[PDB]
Amino acid sequence: DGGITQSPKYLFRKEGQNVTLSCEQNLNHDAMYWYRQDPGQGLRLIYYSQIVNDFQKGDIAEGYSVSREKKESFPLTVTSAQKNPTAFYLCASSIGQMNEQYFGPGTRLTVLEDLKNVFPPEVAVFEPSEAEISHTQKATLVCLATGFYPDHVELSWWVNGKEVHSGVSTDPQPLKEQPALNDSRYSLSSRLRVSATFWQNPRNHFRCQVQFYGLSENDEWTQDRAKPVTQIVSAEAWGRAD
């Protein structure tokens, strides 16, 4: 119903490369902000703008630039000058002064030179065990997303075409398949629990969807394998009558 739109949840920034994070809002607010979340002090202001064409620096505006040609947009540019390892950027807007700030979904900008390590995930769904069915009258589908790097994914479940939340339990964070190594790829899993009777209808459909935030179409790909571009990887299953 009209909120804030910013850059995708995850982005790649090659060292010494200039990247711009969009941020637009249709709330007709005048005040727009850009924050960076640093492990210690949490959220910290980068740039702030009270009206068109104006911007007041924050304590960490070093290496960043913004513009405010229009009331709706406040694009933040992270220049090669910036030297942060990887951060989380958050955009916001408010009526102005000190009324009330509304926040965007945030964006994690991961900085890395090497690009040969990037891999989209492989996804699978495993049907519930008859044992589970005939003992709790519930059915639990399991989704496994594996072999991806970096950990730039978002998992969701779709039942009969619509996204669902109740009965969904997803790991809080992707885990390294080999914590030992460093060039380790990641895995992530989730469970969807539904009634047994629902799972037993052959017409019901279940889909596990994993959004991978990879390379852009502009990025150059040297390797031979398809470029790990942003994409959707899914796995599905139909209901099975015992």
**Choice between 165 and 225, CB closer to a copy of itself:** 165
x/- string (CB under 8 A) for a copy of itself, residues 106-145?
Answer: ----------------------------------------
d(CA 136, CA 146): 29
**Choice between 110 and 184, CB closer to a copy of itself:** 110
The radius of gyration computed from the CA coordinates of the chain, to the nearest angstrom, equals 21
Which range touches a copy of itself (CB under 8 A), out of 8-16, 48-56, 90-98, 168-176? 8-16
- Backbone torsion region of residue 188, taken as left when φ is above 0, otherwise alpha when ψ lies between -120 and 50, otherwise beta: beta
The one among 44, 138, 205, 227 contacting a copy of itself by CB under 8 A: 205
The number of CA neighbours under 13 Å toward the Cβ of 104 is 29
The one among 15, 38, 62, 69 contacting a copy of itself by CB under 8 A: 69
The one among 27, 37, 72, 119 contacting a copy of itself by CB under 8 A: 72
**Which residues, 13 to 42, sit near a copy of itself by CB under 8 A?**
19-22, 24, 26
The number of CA neighbours under 13 Å toward the Cβ of 147 is 8
- CA-closest candidate to residue 110, choices 86, 139, 89, 127: 86
d(CA 8, CA 177): 25
Scanning the structure block, which residue is given the tokens 């885990």?
175
Binding site for a copy of itself (CB under 8 A): 1-2, 5-9, 11, 19-22, 24, 26, 69-70, 72-73, 75, 105, 154, 159-162, 164-166, 195, 197-198, 201-205, 207, 211, 213, 216-218, 230, 232, 234, 236-238
